[PDB]
Structures are given as C-alpha cells and as structure tokens.
Design a protein around this ligand. Structure first.
Ligand SMILES: Nc1ncnc2c1ncn2[C@@H]1O[C@H](COP(=O)(O)OP(=O)(O)OP(=O)(O)O)[C@@H](O)[C@H]1O
Ligand SMILES: [Ca+2]
Ligand SMILES: [Ca+2]
Ligand SMILES: [Ca+2]
Lengths: 367, 123
C-alpha cells in the first residue's frame, strides 16, 4: 500500500516521484531565489516560480557540479519537493535519495541529518546515481558515462559496486555547452546574454544539435549545401536560423579546447577510466558502456563514441555503447525499481537507528 | 526478517531458478526448469561442491527479449544482493535471450526452451 518517495537531485534539474512508477511525476529546476534586499514577499521561491521572478530575486544553484554547496537552499528544495510538487508528507514515506560519485563523507551525513531531524522521515537510503543507471539498463557490470548540466562522470562498475580509484570527474557539462552555443551564435549577430535568453538557447540546443561522426569531414560537406541549416521560432514570434553550430556545440564534449579547457574529451576520459581497472574485467567494461543524463541525448553520440573508442582500444576488443531512450530519467528509474524490491524493505536506515547512531550511520548502511 | 528464498539459496549442490514477479523474487516450479518466458526475467544459481567442502556459486540473470525494464533491473539487483548474501563468492553472468553462454545453456540437458508471454510489469 504505502510506497516510498524517490528523489534524484541534480545540478540543474530535480527528478522526484513515487516508487513503482515507471517515471518521475515531477521535474523542475534546482534553483532558489530570495529577495536581493513588501507584502507576501514571500521569503524564498523555488523552481519555475523563481525563474518567473528574476527581477526581484538573486537566484542560486544549491548543487554545484553534482555536489551540494548550500544546505539552507538544499533544504528549501526538498521542502518544495515534498509539499508543493509531490504533495506527500515526508514523515509518512521512506525516502530514497541519490548522490554524485566521490561525494564527501560530510555531505552524506549532512543529507542524513536533515532527512531525520528536519523532515522527520521514518526511513532513508542514499544511492550512487550511476549505479542506479546501470541497474535500470539491466546490468551489474559495466561503465557508465553520466553527463548532465553541471558535471560529467565516468564510473566503472563490477558486480553491483563501483570502483572509486577508476572514477573520473569532468567539469564540462550541458550548461557549458549552452553558454558555448550563445557565444558562437554571435557569428550570426544574435545577441543572447540575459538569463532569460539563456533558457531559450538551451532549447535550441536540445532541439537541433547533433553529434557529427567525423567533425573535420562534416564541416566540409555542411559548408557546401544548405540542408544543415535549420530554422527556430523564438517565443516572440521571430524566426532565426542555425547551421553548423548544431554539431560545433556538442563537439566540446570531445574537444574541450573549444571552451578554453585543457581537459580531455569524454571518449578519452572513458578510455582512461577503463584502463585503471583490473585486466580481468576490461572486456565487460568495453562491451557495456552505458550512457545517462540529458547531455548524452545528442543524436548520433553512440556512433561517435563507438568508433572513437575502438581507435584507442585493442583491435580484438568488441565495443558496445548503449543509449537507452529513457536515459534522461535512467537514474530515477533505477531508484524507483530498487526501492520497490521486497528485499530492500530491510536495507532502509530507520529512525530508531539514527537516534542511536546519528548521521555517521549512513557510511555503514549505504554500501 | 529476511527473504525465505535467500535462506534457501546455495545450501545444497544443484540448480536453483527464480523468476522476477512484481518487484519480488519467486521460485520457479522444478518441473518447469528450462522453460523461460520471453517476456520475463529470471535468476539462476548453480551450486557446485568442492573438495574442501565449500560451495562454488555462479549467478546468471536471464533477460527475455520482451521483458520489461522493471523486471530486467530487478534481476540485476537481486543478483548483486544474492551475491552479497553469499559472502560475495559468486561470479555474476548477464545472459541475454539468443546470446546465452555455453555454460548457462549447458545447465539444461533437454535444452533451453522459450515460451511467449509472461507475468505483468510491476509498473
Ligand atoms: N535532447 C537533448 N539533447 C541534448 N541535451 C539535452 C537534451 N535534453 C536535455 N539536455 C541537457 O541535459 C541537461 C540536463 O540533464 P540532467 O537533468 O541529467 O542534469 P542534472 O542531473 O542536473 O546534471 P548533474 O549530472 O550535474 O546532476 C541540460 O543541461 C540539458 O541542456
Ligand atoms: Ca545528474
Ligand atoms: Ca513480464
Ligand atoms: Ca561475487
């Protein structure tokens, strides 16, 4: 009868819903706005209601690169998630949360203290996001490439558990690609700058952009014809056009130099991540490269990786890049499934346990 | 306090098969071993006796071509959990319909059988 709540926190978007559901019922931006300096102020706004009041608000992202940086704001996000979005009392439901890889032990405890002390939950569990994605793909062993709005991660997983020594971080993600698109569109005179104009450009990116199988060759053939050119209707009613920017933009994932970064591309970062793993399992990693996150939704991305990795890997090594259509919510879906299992009923951290052991209990109960 | 099927798991040498039914691990009738629903997901544990008295474990989670995501993910998780319950001494295997390893198919003398249909999704 009584199902549990599942929340996948993100640098840009929150995914919340109920276990047993095949998808999250609520998806809103991880933004918190407060007055910069009369009546129902109110005091603090969240999500879409905050973006609809930019004029009198100093907006902030509680999570930065997959990591919480403001707990006062993080607590506000969760409040809105429970009472305004889900319409469910936290004290009446278990709560499955997600966390980035290499999440400091301090944040795990803090996130636990809040759930029990502030929202008075009966139960709680925390899971690594990428591990949930692999589970949703129906795998116990594989390497996940999670790329969202604020951070990208490659994390090898073997028999259910991840390998921290081989996990690689990358401060290149969708928001950087958004900012990059705004920059190159000045080659057409289009002057997008405002935080409002940043959201419309974000849509152009998600609608028109695609991964070129061969960048140098794609650039040549695209310059000749006009089929590359696509139109996009601005919300005012004006119509602009976009051409090679469609694959120049998401190319920063493979060539961070376009953004002014000495970092390595995702194909190379995925390669190095696997190389750090024991030899006896590399085959299973190469043959189960799973994608998750919205930034991995670009058309023709698997075709690029599948061929770019083969260039680096042994000639004999079979390579399969998996691109599930639902991979925008693959993390959440993994949570929904896991927290629905008959066996998980005794893996929860209970209230009794917290009162007896405190926030430090999360380290021993969650992996 | 703990899942009865886990308590049954890997105690005697032989072959155990469970099917995922609505976010739960259910035993398959012994007289239906070898017959898999293409629309479901199964968990298989082969137990072998060693010279030193200990038991060897191999965990194969089988995924039908028409199985739903909740079933496929549950099988995976169940495999990890059953592996941990067995002190992690079990080797995990992902078996997809049509690409089953020789080891897996070799478990069945009369051969692997496919059947259409299956239990409904937990979604
Ligand atoms: N169809 C699409 N094509 C390309 N990019 C997309 C598409 N849909 C969404 N995105 C991008 O994916 C990002 C959102 O992904 P997600 O919701 O996983 O972010 P997140 O979970 O907050 O990121 P993080 O990994 O930092 O937590 C946005 O930056 C958005 O621009
Ligand atoms: Ca994310
Ligand atoms: Ca089924
Ligand atoms: Ca094991």
């Amino acid at each position: 009868e009584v199902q549990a709540l599942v929340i996948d926190n993100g640098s840009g978007n929150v995914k919340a819903g109920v276990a047993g559901d095949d998808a999250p019922r609520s998806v809103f931006p991880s933004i918190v706005g407060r007055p910069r300096h009369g009546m129902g102020q109110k005091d603090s706004y969240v999500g879409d209601e905050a973006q609809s009041k930019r004029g009198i608000l100093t907006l902030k992202y509680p999570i930065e690169h997959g990591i919480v940086t403001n707990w006062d704001d993080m607590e506000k996000i969760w409040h809105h998630t429970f009472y305004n979005e889900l319409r469910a009392a936290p004290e009446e439901h278990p709560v499955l949360l997600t966390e980035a890889p290499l999440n400091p032990k301090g944040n795990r405890e803090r996130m636990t203290q809040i759930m029990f002390e502030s929202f008075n939950v009966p139960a709680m569990y925390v899971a690594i996001q990428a591990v949930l994605s692999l589970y949703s793909s129906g795998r116990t062993t594989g390497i996940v490439l999670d790329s969202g709005d604020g951070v990208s991660h490659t994390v090898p997983i073997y028999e259910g558990y991840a390998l921290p020594h081989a996990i690689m971080r990358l401060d290149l993600a969708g928001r950087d690609l958004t900012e990059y698109l705004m920059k190159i569109l000045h080659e057409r005179g289009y002057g997008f700058s405002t935080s409002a104009e940043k959201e419309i450009v974000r849509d152009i990116k998600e609608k028109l952009c695609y991964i070129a199988l061969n960048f140098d060759e794609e650039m040549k053939t695209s310059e000749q014809s006009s089929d590359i050119e696509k139109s996009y209707e601005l919300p005012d009613g004006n119509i602009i056009t976009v051409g090679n920017e469609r694959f120049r933009c998401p190319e920063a994932l493979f060539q961070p130099s376009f953004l002014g970064k000495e970092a390595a591309g995702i194909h190379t970062t995925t390669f190095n991540s696997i190389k750090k793993c024991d030899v006896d399992i590399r085959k299973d990693l190469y043959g189960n490269i799973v994608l998750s996150g919205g930034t991995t939704m670009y058309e023709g991305i698997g075709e690029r990786l599948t061929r770019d990795i083969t260039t680096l890997a042994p000639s004999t090594m079979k390579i399969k890049v998996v691109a599930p259509p639902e991979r925008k919510y693959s993390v959440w879906i993994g949570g929904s499934i896991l927290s629905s299992l008959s066996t998980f009923q005794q893996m929860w951290i209970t209230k009794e346990e917290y009162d007896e052991s405190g926030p430090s209990i999360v380290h021993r109960k969650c992996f | 306090v703990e899942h009865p099927e886990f308590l049954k798991a890997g105690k005697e040498p032989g072959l155990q098969i469970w099917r995922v039914e609505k976010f739960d691990l259910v035993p398959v009738p012994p007289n239906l071993y070898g017959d898999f629903f293409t629309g479901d997901a199964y968990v298989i544990l082969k137990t072998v006796q060693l010279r030193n008295g200990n038991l060897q474990y191999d965990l194969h989670y089988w995924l039908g071509n028409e199985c739903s995501q909740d079933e496929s993910g549950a099988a995976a998780i169940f495999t990890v959990q059953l592996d941990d319950y067995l002190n992690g001494r079990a080797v995990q295997h992902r078996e997809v319909q049509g690409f089953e390893s020789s080891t897996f198919s070799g478990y069945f003398k009369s051969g692997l059988k496919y059947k259409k249909g299956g239990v409904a999704s937990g979604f």
